[PDB]
Design a protein around this ligand. Sequence first.
Ligand SMILES: NC(=[NH2+])c1cc2c(I)cccc2s1
Ligand SMILES: [Ca+2]
Ligand code: NA
Lengths: 36, 252, 10
Amino acid sequence: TFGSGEADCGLRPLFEKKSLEDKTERELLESYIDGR
Amino acid sequence: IVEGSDAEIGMSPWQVMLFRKSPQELLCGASLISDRWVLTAAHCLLYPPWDKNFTENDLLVRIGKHSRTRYERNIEKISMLEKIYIHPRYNWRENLDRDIALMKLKKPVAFSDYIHPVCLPDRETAASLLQAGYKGRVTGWGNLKETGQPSVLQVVNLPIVERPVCKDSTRIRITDNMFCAGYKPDEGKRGDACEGDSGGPFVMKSPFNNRWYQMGIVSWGEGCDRDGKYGFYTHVFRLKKWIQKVIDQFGE
Amino acid sequence: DFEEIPEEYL
Ligand SMILES: NC(=[NH2+])c1cc2c(I)cccc2s1
Ligand SMILES: [Ca+2]
Ligand code: NA
């Protein structure tokens, strides 16, 4: 809804919430000059 | 989406479908930002050049979908609109500057494994992620080729491009309320949004807090996946105050 | 091409 979202925004039930990654998100994180 | 692949189930739980009641057809893409508000592109609702001016009563919002044509019983939710708000300075006469609109749902939707809102960026997230070279994701049910419609939701990941390159690929006057994305002819990688994808979300995943933020809205392009051309997107963060304003002036 | 949707939404 607002500032940085909602509260539980952006955390997907089937992925982040279960600590599961979708098949191409790595591509994205790898472009922010690598993530983690 | 051109050169994108099928999405996985629950990959973009914030993806919404603007559906026309009669004829029953896919109008545009949109996104769920809270349990009562959907964000889309203003040209999806108002575009006088083509006598397009939709109203509350002419649309339906379908949330939780994967398949483009099937009514996914017990999975998707269909809502009606209470109000539509177009940015007061949306410029349809020249370059679709401030191509943004908010729709208030008749009743709040309930989240599920297939329905979840996306976050709207704050100054700092915007500042660190909206950089040339960083990739974002666009999703939609739009066309597969310029001139070819998918059965399922498609996804493509694209890099943000430097503004001078964006300005030098077109004759249209680009404003600070827009950014462009896509691969350079030189990158031997393709992908783009296309007809039917308008209004949908351009999102990025924060490496700081693992959340997905919606940085842009699919606004316009010249053809689909043409070499030397890029897609343009509304800059959400630049119009966030307008968003906050209508939301806490008219609801939540 | 679109499958029919239930009448209580029109
Ligand atoms: N190439 C593109 N990114 C787009 C092309 C279009 C078209 I053609 C219509 C509506 C929206 C868009 S985005
Ligand atoms: Ca130019
Ligand atoms: Na291109």
